[PDB]
Amino acid sequence: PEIVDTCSLASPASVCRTKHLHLRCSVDFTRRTLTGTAALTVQSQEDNLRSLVLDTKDLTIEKVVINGQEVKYALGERQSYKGSPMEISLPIALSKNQEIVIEISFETSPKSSALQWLTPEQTSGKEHPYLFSQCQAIHCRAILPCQDTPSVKLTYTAEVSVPKELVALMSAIRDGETPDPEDPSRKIYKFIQKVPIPCYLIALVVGALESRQIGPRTLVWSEKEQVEKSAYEFSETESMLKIAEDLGGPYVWGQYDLLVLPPSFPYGGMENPCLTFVTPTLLAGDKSLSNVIAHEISHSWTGNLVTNKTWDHFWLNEGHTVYLERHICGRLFGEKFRHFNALGGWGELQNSVKTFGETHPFTKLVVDLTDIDPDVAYSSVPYEKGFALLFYLEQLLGGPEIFLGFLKAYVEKFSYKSITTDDWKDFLYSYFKDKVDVLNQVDWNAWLYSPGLPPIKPNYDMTLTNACIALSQRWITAKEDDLNSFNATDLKDLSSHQLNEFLAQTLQRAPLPLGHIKRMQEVYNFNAINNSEIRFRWLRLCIQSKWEDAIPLALKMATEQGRMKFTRPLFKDLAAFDKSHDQAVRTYQEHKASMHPVTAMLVGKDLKVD
Ligand SMILES: NCCCC(=O)Nc1ccc(OCc2ccccc2)cc1
Numbered sequence: 001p002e003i004v005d006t007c008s009l010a011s012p013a014s015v016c017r018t019k020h021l022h023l024r025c026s027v028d029f030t031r032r033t034l035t036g037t038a039a040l041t042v043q044s045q046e047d048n049l050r051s052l053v054l055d056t057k058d059l060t061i062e063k064v065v066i067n068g069q070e071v072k073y074a075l076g077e078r079q080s081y082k083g084s085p086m087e088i089s090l091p092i093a094l095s096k097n098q099e100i101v102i103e104i105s106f107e108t109s110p111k112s113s114a115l116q117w118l119t120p121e122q123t124s125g126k127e128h129p130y131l132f133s134q135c136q137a138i139h140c141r142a143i144l145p146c147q148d149t150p151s152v153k154l155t156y157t158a159e160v161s162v163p164k165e166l167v168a169l170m171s172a173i174r175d176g177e178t179p180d181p182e183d184p185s186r187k188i189y190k191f192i193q194k195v196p197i198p199c200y201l202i203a204l205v206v207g208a209l210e211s212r213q214i215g216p217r218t219l220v221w222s223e224k225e226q227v228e229k230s231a232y233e234f235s236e237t238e239s240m241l242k243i244a245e246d247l248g249g250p251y252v253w254g255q256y257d258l259l260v261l262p263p264s265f266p267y268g269g270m271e272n273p274c275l276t277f278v279t280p281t282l283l284a285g286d287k288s289l290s291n292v293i294a295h296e297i298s299h300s301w302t303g304n305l306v307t308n309k310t311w312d313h314f315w316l317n318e319g320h321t322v323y324l325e326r327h328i329c330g331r332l333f334g335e336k337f338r339h340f341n342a343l344g345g346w347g348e349l350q351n352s353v354k355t356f357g358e359t360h361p362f363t364k365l366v367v368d369l370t371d372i373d374p375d376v377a378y379s380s381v382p383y384e385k386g387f388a389l390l391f392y393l394e395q396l397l398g399g400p401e402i403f404l405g406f407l408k409a410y411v412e413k414f415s416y417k418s419i420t421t422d423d424w425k426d427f428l429y430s431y432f433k434d435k436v437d438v439l440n441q442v443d444w445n446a447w448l449y450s451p452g453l454p455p456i457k458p459n460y461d462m463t464l465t466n467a468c469i470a471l472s473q474r475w476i477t478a479k480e481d482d483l484n485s486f487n488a489t490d491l492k493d494l495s496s497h498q499l500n501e502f503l504a505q506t507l508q509r510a511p512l513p514l515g516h517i518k519r520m521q522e523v524y525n526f527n528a529i530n531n532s533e534i535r536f537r538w539l540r541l542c543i544q545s546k547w548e549d550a551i552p553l554a555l556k557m558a559t560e561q562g563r564m565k566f567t568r569p570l571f572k573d574l575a576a577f578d579k580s581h582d583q584a585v586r587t588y589q590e591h592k593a594s595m596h597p598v599t600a601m602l603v604g605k606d607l608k609v610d
């Protein structure tokens with residue numbers, strides 16, 4: 001009707017709108033707090049606007065300055081993962097389009113769900129601490145007060161004081177560094193973002209950061225120790241950027257920097273404008289996990305330019321991005337590779353539907369997050385059910401060239417806007433008006449609103465998948481007399497991508513007999529492989545098949561890195577295996593204070609502790 005964001009307690013975009021944020025703050029590593037001022041330019045959309053509501057979580061409100069003086073504010077009671085509402089009394093009754101600056105001084109709790117503060121022990125260099133944010137989905141409200149909904153877009157400017165030996169970086173173009181006036185011993189790093197973004201894309205890192213040039217508009221940022229390994233790993237970036245512009249239109253953000261974060265960073269990447277954050281688990285040393293870079297580049301259009309209006313429509317962000325990602329890798333390595341990766345995607349979707357259950361609400365494409373913590377709903381479903389829909393539609397409407405024309409125009413039309421599934425679908429019909437009859441063969445109700453597997457499977461080239469299936473199946477159906485025929489030559493012609501897919505297929509049918517999984521380690525030596533995607537699935541397969549020797553390997557992987565994609569299922573498998581159950585829980589209890597806060601709360605929920 002007139003859409004409301006159910007994950008926000010803030011006044012909606014239909015009442016007022018944040019157009020800009022000015023951010024002055026200092027990063028205190030001893031108190032583990034961000035202190036400062038957050039000045040919001042807000043614009044009324046109705047007449048007689050006498051007060052507005054902002055989202056907060058564990059925020060200490062020092063003062064709220066409007067037009068020079070101090071004003072009357074009022075924090076409501078805590079509302080769970082959502083935090084507490086901050087209703088602000090305005091001294092002037094605002095009328096249509098009239099703007100106002102609400103300057104709000106503030107401190108962040110040390111247990112901010114947006115932030116992980118690391119000690120020197122937890123870093124590579126061992127001598128300096130570190131900070132990083134991760135605002136998506138609704139954690140920006142835990143760094144500063146805001147309409148913490150992606151239905152609102154705002155430019156922002158920032159100045160941030162940090163210990164003089166550490167570097168700050170933000171999701172913005174760097175606007176110079178200068179010694180701090182108020183107290184030496186600290187620099188003040190300055191930042192500006194002229195493209196209006198949703199607040200989930202505001203982002204901050206602070207640490208012993210060096211850089212390295214790997215393309216005309218790209219430096220990799222990490223700690224001394226990883227900088228070199230990473231320059232090698234993400235060399236393909238500029239070439240990916242070029243393809244992405246041919247598919248998406250002009251890359252408008254100015255810079256595309258990459259930041260390789262500490263092992264505890266909870267996702268494969270986060271698409272922070274001008275500075276993409278990635279897991280060091282990408283550092284396989286052969287560029288084989290560069291699809292993740294492809295994916296983050298693509299968010300510079302689908303996500304960051306065209307944005308889900310609410311998190312219910314999150315598939316728009318991820319479905320499109322995965323579609324662009326797979327085009328990028330297709331251009332670089334061939335159409336048969338794009339189909340290989342698309343089919344694996346369907347396989348991940350099958351695992352998601354089986355894990356949640358086929359009638360589960362989070363297997364729907366468009367969801368309802370009323371009273372659900374977004375972090376708990378998060379999964380592969382919006383990624384792979386979304387991709388599957390786009391892929392099916394590509395095939396139905398006359399193929400990738402024709403569908404990529406829809407894509408670029410879709411991006412062009414909704415650029416700098418926040419939109420829903422209906423905006424997307426209404427534009428699909430508009431663009432493809434000469435094929436409306438074809439569009440009406442789509443079971444829109446099933447695809448969009450029904451749980452489980454999609455009602456139709458797309459068509460996939462098999463070239464590269466067949467070798468994975470033959471071998472997965474040989475193992476799944478092996479008896480005693482087959483075990484001596486397996487041999488390291490079985491892998492002679494398989495890429496790392498195919499080893500991974502082979503293990504993914506085998507894992508779908510776990511458990512295998514213990515003797516079989518031992519034999520697999522003997523002929524193939526998967527223990528020696530450091531590729532995190534491969535090691536992950538191999539250790540799942542081992543634990544789920546009751547192999548005790550895999551226990552210390554799986555505990556090591558689950559705690560020495562904390563990308564949730566790997567950490568969560570390794571903990572869960574370890575907990576379901578009777579031999580490792582107690583050690584899994586104890587390991588969790590002993591690590592949970594030095595863990596990222598969203599990851600710690602999720603692993604705790606998975607392990608049914610507290
Ligand atoms: N996009 C970069 C990776 C981080 C990320 O996407 N985080 C994130 C996204 C959505 C979310 O919650 C909303 C949701 C979950 C599942 C389905 C639909 C919406 C929570 C975290």
Ligand SMILES: [Yb+3]
Nearest residue numbers: 479480481482
């Ligand atoms: Yb046999």
Ligand SMILES: [Zn+2]
Nearest residue numbers: 295299318321
């Ligand atoms: Zn994404």
